[model samples]
Target chain A: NQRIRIRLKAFDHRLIDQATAEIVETAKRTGAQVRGPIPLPTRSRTHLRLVDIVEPTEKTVDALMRLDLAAGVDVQISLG
Target chain B: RPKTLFEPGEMVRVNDGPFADFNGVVEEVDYEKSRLKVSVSIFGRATPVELDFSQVEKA
Candidate 1:
């Protein structure tokens, strides 16, 4: 467990994009070296994206925050 | 008002209107005007949405 990765996938990219920006800002505020938002391969199918980070408590808060942003958009998180 | 219908820092779903069916975190509240502000995420972006206090129920 040396890094944190946030995975977000929603029917709408626009919404996930918005949520991504916020997490980026939040992670930046946490002061961790970050990388991500790499769009996964897909075509009119479910999305698989990543917004890497290095935290937990706050990250989940952000995790659910994204769904709140879209009502029902889906997202997942991983720590390594 | 139903044991405080809303409060800051709570997750709530958009109960009605064009924004209905979304969930967001409560940001601000104005009991006098019965208005509440919720921070909602959309497409990797964040927007603070204003809504009637009753427009959102606990999620």
Candidate 2:
């Protein structure tokens, strides 16, 4: 199983947490293991960085597009 | 314009704008955000600043 993490910057924690939960639930349906939308160190007081991990069979680029998610934040996916 | 490549944890001279000649170490790379967080030392004070990735080059 491949482990992938999606990282992004969010202006507020609430929206990121909400979106992360939704993404995790959707990813679960695809049989991929999902981990947190954890926060990263932020330089801006109003902004926060977050990360979510998923295990997917296909490339993260393809999976993300297929999910049809809105771009509420800047997202980067790393595979392991 | 000269193209500059930055690697993580390197001290670089920011040669443009108000920060001209200021030096900092790259703390993070965020291509999607088109910015980088750098820890800068200026006038004996060290602080982290998020700057446009396009504005810096290796000193």
Candidate 3:
């Protein structure tokens, strides 16, 4: 039950990239397996973010779900 | 200051040309010609097609 999929998006790409870096940092330190800062684009070239976490520890999921993200960045989470 | 968003194995959505609105996975990028070779699902089969760099964005 530890597989997590997240999508983050922002009209401003920089903000989304920044938020991703922070999440990656946290995941790295929490002994989680991570994949992607993969980018998906939308209308007018707005960037969307995708990250997959495998077997995440409780702390890793807690910190990521409750983390303060950048303004204009929206997050979507799913358990897979 | 656009970042390099296309690479082999990455998914992209076609926004221009004949494949418009199709979602595909990148197979090859021809940087010299600013083109992409992608595998797009067509009629439930994986089909390879050629597209311009400007025709796609990361997906």
Candidate 4:
């Protein structure tokens, strides 16, 4: 299982859009099947989850993290 | 934002998160609060929680 957690600045729609687009682009490069930019609405912060199925390569994970950082997002990745 | 997935009086399953597997009724909608106060049957009694609209989907 490959999962990435991202925290973005609240209500910054421009960065959020950029981050999501980057995630998709990176996934394409890594040959991963992507699931979402599912929105999680909370009182304090908005959250997003992107699910991907890949070969569990570091390059794939690294690519995702780099994209997130480039878009000014804080991210965590978990693999199982 | 008003929800397009749920309607009042409908029974829904709360999947994932804290109230996972819980079932509830779509009671009052407080748009100003962005919450759905759901009446749920838990431990054979009805309880309510003002859930964030995003935490739930149409059951």
Query: Best candidate, lDDT-wise?
Result: 3
Q: In model 2, how well does chain A match by TM-score?
A: 0.64
lDDT of 2 by residue, A13-63 (tens): 666666676667666766666676566667675445455555574443344
* Most DockQ-accurate candidate: 2
Which order, best to worst by lDDT? 3, 1, 2, 4
After best superposition, candidate 4 residue A21: deviation in angstroms? 1.3
In candidate 2, position B18 carries an lDDT of 34
- List where candidate 4 sits over 4 angstroms from the true fold: A1-9, A45-54, A65-72, B1-59
| Worst 10 contiguous positions by lDDT, candidate 3 chain B | B40-49
**TM-score of decoy 2:** 0.44
- Per-candidate TM vs. native? 0.44, 0.44, 0.53, 0.41
For model 4 chain A, give the 10-residue run with minimal summed lDDT: A71-80
What would you estimate as the lDDT of candidate 2?
0.58
Error of 3 at B8 (Å): 40
Worst 10 residues of 1 chain B by lDDT: B39-48
- Candidate 1 is graded, for docking, as incorrect
Per prediction, fnat is 0.00, 0.00, 0.00, 0.00
Off by over 4 Å in 2: A52-54, A59-63, B1-59
| Predicted candidate 2 versus true structure: per-residue lDDT over B1-59, tens digit per residue | 54456668877766544354678888787777777667555334344556665577764
Deviation in Å, model 2, residue A23 alpha carbon: 2.0
Q: Tell me the tens digit of each residue's lDDT in model 4 across A1-80.
A: 43433333334656666766776678768866666656666435544544443553556655653442443443333232
Cα lDDT of model 3 by residue, A8-31, tens digit: 777898898998998888777778
